[PDB]
Every structure is written in C-alpha cells, then in structure tokens.
Amino acid sequence: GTPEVKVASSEDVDLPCTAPWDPQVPYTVSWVKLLEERPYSLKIRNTTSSNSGTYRCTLQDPDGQRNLSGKVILRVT
Numbered sequence: 411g412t413p414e415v416k417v418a419s420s421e422d423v424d425l426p427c428t429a430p431w432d433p434q435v436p437y438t439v440s441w442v443k444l445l446e447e448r449p450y451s452l453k454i455r456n457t458t459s460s461n462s463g464t465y466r467c468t469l470q471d472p473d474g475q476r477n478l479s480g481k482v483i484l485r486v487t
Contacts, residue, residue, distance in 0.1 A: 412464070414483040417457050420441035424451040428480030437469035437478075444481070457486045 414447060417423040426449035441449045444464045454461055461484060468479040 412481050414420075414482050414485060416485045416487060419458055419486050420456055422453065423457055423484065424448075424453050425465055425482055425484060426451050427469065428482050429467055430480065431468045431469050431478055436472060440468045440470065440471045442466050442468075454484075457484075458470050459479040462486045 413428060414424075415423060415425060418485070425441075426448060427439060427452070437450065441442050441452045442465070444466055450467060450469060452467070464468065464483050466479055466482055467480045470477045
C-alpha cells in the first residue's frame with residue numbers, strides 16, 4: 411500500500427512526504443532511505459538507477475513530543 415513515484419533517469423524529482431500531517435502545524439522534516447506547493451518533499455537532482463528504493467519521511471512536532479512518518483517508493487527509469 412506504499413505509493414510510488416517513477417521518474418526518468420537524469421531528471422530531478424521532488425519525493426513527497428506521505429506522513430499524515432496537520433497543515434496548521436509547522437514541522438521539521440527528516441528523510442532516510444530504507445536499505446535493510448507541497449511541503450516537506452525531498453529534492454533529488456539528476457536521478458540515477460542508484461536512487462531507486464524506499465524512502466521514509468518523519469515530521470517532528472515543534473514541542474518535540476511527537477512525530478509522524480510515512481513511506482514512499484522511488485523507481486528511476
């Protein structure tokens with residue numbers, strides 16, 4: 411059930427943060443790649459096949475007491 415983004419190689423992509431955030435709350439964002447307009451996106455320039463995989467965004471509340479996370483798949487072609 412994880413959404414996917416496909417992009418042609420050498421094109422830039424803004425990977426969307428799929429955490430279910432509250433638009434009236436300002437978050438800080440942290441992105442990881444799991445190996446083993448629209449805010450909070452991750453810019454990946456000049457994509458290559460290497461960039462394909464599963465990514466996780468985590469949004470941190472201002473007070474630092476809670477966070478929200480969501481995953482997205484990138485396929486570079």
